[PDB]
Assembly symmetry: D2
Homo-oligomer: 115 residues x 4
């Protein structure tokens, strides 16, 4: 139900080995760690959760873009790219969170499908 | 030293009356809110800080995109758009944070001079 | 070797049934029709060419974004989204041309892989 | 009535000295070039046309992105970025064509007032 895809707009390639941390907001308001992983050679990260665990809630996906650029010798603008959204408010959906990275810019898009 | 500009990709216009909150990261790793405003008729927000107060640090700019889309009667995906950056790491700079908004996508860019 | 993917940034979905026309620039400078098709239910168009036909050259991918919006009742800004690029200049590559559509904006990205 | 603004997503700056050519579609479906310029130190190009000459029609704005990246020593994907639009269909408007450039990606947006 949740996939993250990261692309590099400088090289026109997948952004490989990008760390991603996902959090869910608890009923106390705090950000509870929910899942993490790193992007594969295709720039994708699958397997973060399951339909049953991925309940309604407010989720945050934090993509460690700074470390990605630093490893390429670049000092980028952003510390990270953070995507915050309410999920499954009108029933279960599949979410693809895509990010397109440049040193001084990022774009993010959600593709939401009803399986 | 800090300006925010917001555009609406649906209407082809400045995004007017968008709330923007700015925070500085505190020593305890919490976000200390210290400036806010809303975008003008040109989609711009000026006057958030001054040269003397805008010292090196990590800053967060939160743009209340959800409220903007709700006011237009359009279903949005994100809660907000957040920009987090280390400022002034090599000297004081002028920063323009530009955001281009769609209901299920946004982009943000920094123009640093 | 050539795939086109189109997404709708208003609904967070694939842009389905989008017409795409591909042209190649001839040695006379004119744009020669090369391939066409329409995006599937996943927003993707595959099967446009083959490794052997997709020689070095300058290609244009024209995505009929206006008709897509018009069918949704919208009068968009752009007539189309046109992506023009030199292909295979340093040997055969696979190209994914992605476009992200809004009524008054579009983004386009190339992912280029070496198989 | 027509301004072009170009930003560089790699450097976090205006894209300076970028060539821009504007064309109007002719009755024979050919593109008739009629204005050009290059972006200023602020990434902007003003003064392309006037209210009287900018009549309804289909216009193309071609931004020479390839030359810009070559001048920076960066390998680019696209030949150029092209924006094609019908102008003034509902009255005269002011158009700002904004482009945000990366070597393998670009976005373009219209701000129409
Ligand atoms: N001014 C501006 C233009 C585009 Cl096309 C994208 C972004 Cl983030 C800003």
């Amino acid at each position: 139900p949740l996939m993250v895809k990261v692309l590099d707009a400088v090289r026109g390639s997948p952004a490989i080995n990008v760390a991603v941390h996902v959090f869910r907001k608890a009923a106390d308001d705090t950000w509870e760690p929910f899942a993490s992983g790193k992007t594969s050679e295709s720039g994708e990260l699958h397997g973060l959760t399951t339909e049953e665990e991925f309940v309604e809630g407010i989720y945050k996906v934090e993509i460690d873009t700074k470390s990605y650029w630093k490893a390429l010798g670049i000092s980028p603008f952003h510390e990270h790219a953070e995507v915050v959204f309410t999920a499954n408010d009108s029933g279960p959906r599949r979410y693809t969170i895509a990010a397109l990275l440049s040193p001084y810019s990022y774009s993010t898009t959600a593709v939401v499908t009803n399986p």
